[PDB]
Amino acid sequence: MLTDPIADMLTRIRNATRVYKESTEVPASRFKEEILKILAREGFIKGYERVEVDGKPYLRIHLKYGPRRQGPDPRPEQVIKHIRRISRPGRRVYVGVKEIPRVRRGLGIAILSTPKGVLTDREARKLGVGGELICEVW
Amino acid sequence: PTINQLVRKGREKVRKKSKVPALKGAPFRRGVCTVVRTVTPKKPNSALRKVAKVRLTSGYEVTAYIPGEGHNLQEHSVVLIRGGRVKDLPGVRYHIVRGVYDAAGVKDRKKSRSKYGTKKPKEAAKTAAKK
RNA sequence: CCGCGGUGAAUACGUUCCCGGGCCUUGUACACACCGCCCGUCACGCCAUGGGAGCGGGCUCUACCCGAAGUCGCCGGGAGCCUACGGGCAGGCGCCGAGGGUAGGGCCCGUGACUGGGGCGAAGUCGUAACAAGGUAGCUGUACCGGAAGGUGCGGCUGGAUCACCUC
RNA sequence: CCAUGUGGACCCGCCCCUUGGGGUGUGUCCAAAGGGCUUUGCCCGCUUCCGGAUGGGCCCGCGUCCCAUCAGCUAGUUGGUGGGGUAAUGGCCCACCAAGGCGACGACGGGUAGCCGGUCUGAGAGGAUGGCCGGCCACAGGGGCACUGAGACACGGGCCCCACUCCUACGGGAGGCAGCAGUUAGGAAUCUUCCGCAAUGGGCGCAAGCCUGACGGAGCGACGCCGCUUGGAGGAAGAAGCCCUUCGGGGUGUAAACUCCUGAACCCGGGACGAAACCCCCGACGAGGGGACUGACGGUACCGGGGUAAUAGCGCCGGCCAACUCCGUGCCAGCAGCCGCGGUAAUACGGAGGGCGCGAGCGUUACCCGGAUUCACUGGGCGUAAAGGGCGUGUAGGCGGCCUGGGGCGUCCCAUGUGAAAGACCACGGCUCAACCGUGGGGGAGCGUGGGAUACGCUCAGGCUAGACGGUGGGAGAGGGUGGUGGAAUUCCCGGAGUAGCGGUGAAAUGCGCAGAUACCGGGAGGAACGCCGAUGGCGAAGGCAGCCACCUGGUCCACCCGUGACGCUGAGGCGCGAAAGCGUGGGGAGCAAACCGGAUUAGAUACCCGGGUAGUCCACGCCCUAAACGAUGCGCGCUAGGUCUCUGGGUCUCCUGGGGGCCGAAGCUAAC
Numbered sequence A: 001m002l003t004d005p006i007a008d009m010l011t012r013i014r015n016a017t018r019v020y021k022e023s024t025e026v027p028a029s030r031f032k033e034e035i036l037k038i039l040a041r042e043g044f045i046k047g048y049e050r051v052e053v054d055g056k057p058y059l060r061i062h063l064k065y066g067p068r069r070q071g072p073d074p075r076p077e078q079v080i081k082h083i084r085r086i087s088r089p090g091r092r093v094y095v096g097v098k099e100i101p102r103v104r105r106g107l108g109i110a111i112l113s114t115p116k117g118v119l120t121d122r123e124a125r126k127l128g129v130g131g132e133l134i135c136e137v138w
Numbered sequence B: 001p002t003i004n005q006l007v008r009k010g011r012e013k014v015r016k017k018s019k020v021p022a023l024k025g026a027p028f029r030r031g032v033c034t035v036v037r038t039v040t041p042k043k044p045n046s047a048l049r050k051v052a053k054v055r056l057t058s059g060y061e062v063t064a065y066i067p068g069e070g071h072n073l074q075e076h077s078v079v080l081i082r083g084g085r086v087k088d089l090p091g092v093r094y095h096i097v098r099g100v101y102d103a104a105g106v107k108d109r110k111k112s113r114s115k116y117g118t119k120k121p122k123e124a125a126k127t128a129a130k131k
Numbered sequence C: 001c002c003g004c005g006g007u008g009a010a011u012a013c014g015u016u017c018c019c020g021g022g023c024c025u026u027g028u029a030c031a032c033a034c035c036g037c038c039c040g041u042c043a044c045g046c047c048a049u050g051g052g053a054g055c056g057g058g059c060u061c062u063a064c065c066c067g068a069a070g071u072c073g074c075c076g077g078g079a080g081c082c083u084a085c086g087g088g089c090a091g092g093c094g095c096c097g098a099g100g101g102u103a104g105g106g107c108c109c110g111u112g113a114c115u116g117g118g119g120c121g122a123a124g125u126c127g128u129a130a131c132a133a134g135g136u137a138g139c140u141g142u143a144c145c146g147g148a149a150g151g152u153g154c155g156g157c158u159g160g161a162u163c164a165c166c167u168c
Numbered sequence D: 001c002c003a004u005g006u007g008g009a010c011c012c013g014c015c016c017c018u019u020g021g022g023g024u025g026u027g028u029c030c031a032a033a034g035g036g037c038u039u040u041g042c043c044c045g046c047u048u049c050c051g052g053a054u055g056g057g058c059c060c061g062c063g064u065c066c067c068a069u070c071a072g073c074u075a076g077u078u079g080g081u082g083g084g085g086u087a088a089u090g091g092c093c094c095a096c097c098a099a100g101g102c103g104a105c106g107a108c109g110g111g112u113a114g115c116c117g118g119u120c121u122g123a124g125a126g127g128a129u130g131g132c133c134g135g136c137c138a139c140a141g142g143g144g145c146a147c148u149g150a151g152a153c154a155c156g157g158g159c160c161c162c163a164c165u166c167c168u169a170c171g172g173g174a175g176g177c178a179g180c181a182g183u184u185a186g187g188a189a190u191c192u193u194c195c196g197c198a199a200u201g202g203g204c205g206c207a208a209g210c211c212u213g214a215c216g217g218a219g220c221g222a223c224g225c226c227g228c229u230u231g232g233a234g235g236a237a238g239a240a241g242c243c244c245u246u247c248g249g250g251g252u253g254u255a256a257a258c259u260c261c262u263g264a265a266c267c268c269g270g271g272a273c274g275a276a277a278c279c280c281c282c283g284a285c286g287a288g289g290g291g292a293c294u295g296a297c298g299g300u301a302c303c304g305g306g307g308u309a310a311u312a313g314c315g316c317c318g319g320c321c322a323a324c325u326c327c328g329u330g331c332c333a334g335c336a337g338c339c340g341c342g343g344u345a346a347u348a349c350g351g352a353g354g355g356c357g358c359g360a361g362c363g364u365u366a367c368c369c370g371g372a373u374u375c376a377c378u379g380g381g382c383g384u385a386a387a388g389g390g391c392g393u394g395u396a397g398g399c400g401g402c403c404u405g406g407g408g409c410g411u412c413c414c415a416u417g418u419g420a421a422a423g424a425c426c427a428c429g430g431c432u433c434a435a436c437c438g439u440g441g442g443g444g445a446g447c448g449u450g451g452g453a454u455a456c457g458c459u460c461a462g463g464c465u466a467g468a469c470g471g472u473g474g475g476a477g478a479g480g481g482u483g484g485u486g487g488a489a490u491u492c493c494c495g496g497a498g499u500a501g502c503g504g505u506g507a508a509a510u511g512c513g514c515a516g517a518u519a520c521c522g523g524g525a526g527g528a529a530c531g532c533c534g535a536u537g538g539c540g541a542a543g544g545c546a547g548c549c550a551c552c553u554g555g556u557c558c559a560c561c562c563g564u565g566a567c568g569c570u571g572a573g574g575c576g577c578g579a580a581a582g583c584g585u586g587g588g589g590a591g592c593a594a595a596c597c598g599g600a601u602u603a604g605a606u607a608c609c610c611g612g613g614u615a616g617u618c619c620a621c622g623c624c625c626u627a628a629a630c631g632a633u634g635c636g637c638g639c640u641a642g643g644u645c646u647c648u649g650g651g652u653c654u655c656c657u658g659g660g661g662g663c664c665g666a667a668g669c670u671a672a673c
């Protein structure tokens, strides 16, 4: 039994990418599905599409990387070099609007969860709201 | 530790331990010398080093090193203790200031002075600049 | 001593042991490096501390009696003052009350005969426990005997070496 | 005291409100003083009542250190009714009734501490602190108490007790500086027994004005901060001196000398802002206008003239930390923040020269923050470095899968009230600058009220099955407990047979043997463990668990998808389990074996070796609870290459899928291993 539904996903994407898999599956759910909507509009992952496996819903996240490199260790740079969880369970981290994070000096987002859908540091600030700081990706 | 641990039974702040048992803070002490012996050094170094017990105003009978090339302290002299430990003398952790009370500054010294209480010289003994 | 030459042997299975050395490997708590280290002991000194018969001082709870000031409550009467007699004042008694005394229990401040071991500090003492299979593998909980070191018992551990016991 | 009553107070009936708010009815109760002048006028005052103003009481949410080696506190204590008391609620006080109230979301106790605006530090988060100024509290010799009053339970008021010094014909009285100033004690340490009432302010008065160490100021202290000076230009390939110099010269150094220019101190003359009204006059006693007195600081600041070159020190110069030679000294004398430096070449001791730093100051000591991501929220850890609780069960608590809908507590947003002043930031301005001060401006977390959102968390309802649990059927196992049987071996006893030695050791000896041992055969008693299988294996939460058999019992894995429907993971405290040893009662006691008895080795052996031997090892019940109780690595869950060997279930079965044990290894990790 999972303890933190999201964190699970984030990680499942994290390791997934470290071994360069083409895409990984993760338990479906509105939220996660809305959380991946961002990683997708933002370029960290080609995309996700509702899929079934054994009979239970899952989400196929098609990871995105870069080009192969020159010299030793030719593996492709990472698109999601880092993807942490901020607001863990039993640690709820909600930030005001003036408390929203800047994240990797604009090189990365920070998915918030404001009472106005799931937005990113940008949007959320643009709309003028704050809320549970779900994660930080770069 | 879990943050819900840090919550119940938080973090213990770091208490300090004064390496200078000179009551009520106080920067200097007034004590009455008692025995002015000559303790030896320690592991690496060697010689004879002037030192002297001091019945402190606060009530403590603490040892004190006697700086300088030579001094005039005896068995009843009143003295001022500063503070600072010597590393070749276990037990003492305080210094004796000079040119203060029965404690007189060493003669002829010429650089230290402020340290080693010792009114500089007169140099040819004229105004602030002649010689 | 340096050198010359004349005559001219014996023996060597074999590397285990003795002295010196080369390579490889393992252990190491050693690295002016085993003509090493470290632990413990007895002796001289210094700093602090635990216990601690007994005493002194202040503070608190408890039981019972003693209880100032003062406010509240009762009286305030042919014997006190005032009274248009409605009543007021003095005074009296009482509950409460500072504090005090009696016996007992705990708290800390302080003095202290008697006692324990501690840490450190020059040069010394005796043993050799540990460190390399450290010459009885080591450690460990426990029990016992020993001034102490440590010795042996019982079970565990490897944080044990050595092609007995076979991960590097 | 009576009268009076716009009115107001109370009871009581009623209305509008809604806990003693407002309005009303008949009844009852309650006022008061005068003084003064330019006296038919007005000033002051006075009484009652409603309102404003200000100030304050009370109450509540929230926030406020350390120690659980402080864990239980509480009897007026928790509530209730009646009553007392107060301006008002109330255990605030008393009487009765009930028995409760507070506590691990730390009560009770000990220790420490006035709290805040702010200050210091810090990148921030945070830490440390709360002296000056401002707001709040509390105290005034210790303790208690009330009187008077709007207000006090009254610092320079009062009463009693205590201590204390003081007067006393001893019968009894008097005081309190934690007010300014001073004294003494303490101490490393903290000032003038000043001037002024001119100003701002407070008190009383129609006013004149009185009072006021509040305050405005001056003095002392480099205690801190800020500005100022000791001079400015010139002045030789370069004085003297002192230093160094494999001795030619380098250095102090343009530094001085010397020249010229300026001219703090000091002298002369002038000297003020801070001061305008209260009073008096006109006016109307308004508004307004006119008049006049009014300084502590001061003869000070400041301006004008003249005017002399006219205080410097202190720390360091091995590395951190910027600054190097020589002479002395010789593990001495001495340095030292850490590391250390000195035992006859010291850049680390002392002096000299030189140099760096800072400059009326510089060093030092103490303490706070920093560095210290060394208590880590931001920002750490636990295989071997300090760190996983011996294991489990489970309480409080923390945490919680999937879908939809209500709430919308959290959470976010907008408005608004609050967030005084000083300080802080910013702009502007004043004192010749600054320090310091004035004006304006900005922001603020939090908290209150109103409105809004609803993703995520909380709550509620409805629904699902991907967690979990159950069911069906199957498997392995030294899992445990109870009872019972089995063989080997050992020692002891009996019989037979049989001798002279056996045993033991590096060698030996003690020890056992002719009451005939050992060695061999047969039979008997007893205790303990249980070969080979057996393993590089298994099972158990750990400890731990192996002859076989039966029985009672735990857990667990798989196949089926059948049932419930999130029912879950963790787990402070509690409770239970927990090798060996040890302890208690009782039994048993073959072998072994602490202590102990001898033997031998040794320089000596209370030791390694040897021969005996007690507790003990054994079982029963009770106790102990520790451990290298080790994988030295908490539990659960999800995710991330493989290969190889192995145990156990399913399988289209030497291939794939589940559970468990080892090996080697991707990525990754690690200080390395």
Ligand SMILES: [Mg+2]
Residues within 6 Å of the ligand: B022, B026, B027, B028, B029, B030, B057, D188
């Ligand atoms: Mg002192």
Ligand SMILES: [Mg+2]
Residues within 6 Å of the ligand: B119, B120, B121, B122
């Ligand atoms: Mg001098």
Ligand SMILES: [Mg+2]
Residues within 6 Å of the ligand: B126, B127, B128, B129, B130
């Ligand atoms: Mg001079």
Ligand SMILES: [Mg+2]
Residues within 6 Å of the ligand: C134
């Ligand atoms: Mg040894």
Ligand SMILES: [Mg+2]
Residues within 6 Å of the ligand: none
């Ligand atoms: Mg083996």
Ligand SMILES: [Mg+2]
Residues within 6 Å of the ligand: D013
């Ligand atoms: Mg009525």
Ligand SMILES: [Mg+2]
Residues within 6 Å of the ligand: D019, D020
């Ligand atoms: Mg009411």
Ligand SMILES: [Mg+2]
Residues within 6 Å of the ligand: D122
């Ligand atoms: Mg910091």
Ligand SMILES: [Mg+2]
Residues within 6 Å of the ligand: D155, D156, D177
């Ligand atoms: Mg007074």
Ligand SMILES: [Mg+2]
Residues within 6 Å of the ligand: none
């Ligand atoms: Mg006035």
Ligand SMILES: [Mg+2]
Residues within 6 Å of the ligand: D205, D207
């Ligand atoms: Mg007046």
Ligand SMILES: [Mg+2]
Residues within 6 Å of the ligand: none
């Ligand atoms: Mg200041």
Ligand SMILES: [Mg+2]
Residues within 6 Å of the ligand: none
């Ligand atoms: Mg001139």
Ligand SMILES: [Mg+2]
Residues within 6 Å of the ligand: D372
């Ligand atoms: Mg810190």
Ligand SMILES: [Mg+2]
Residues within 6 Å of the ligand: D380, D381
């Ligand atoms: Mg650490």
Ligand SMILES: [Mg+2]
Residues within 6 Å of the ligand: none
């Ligand atoms: Mg949920």
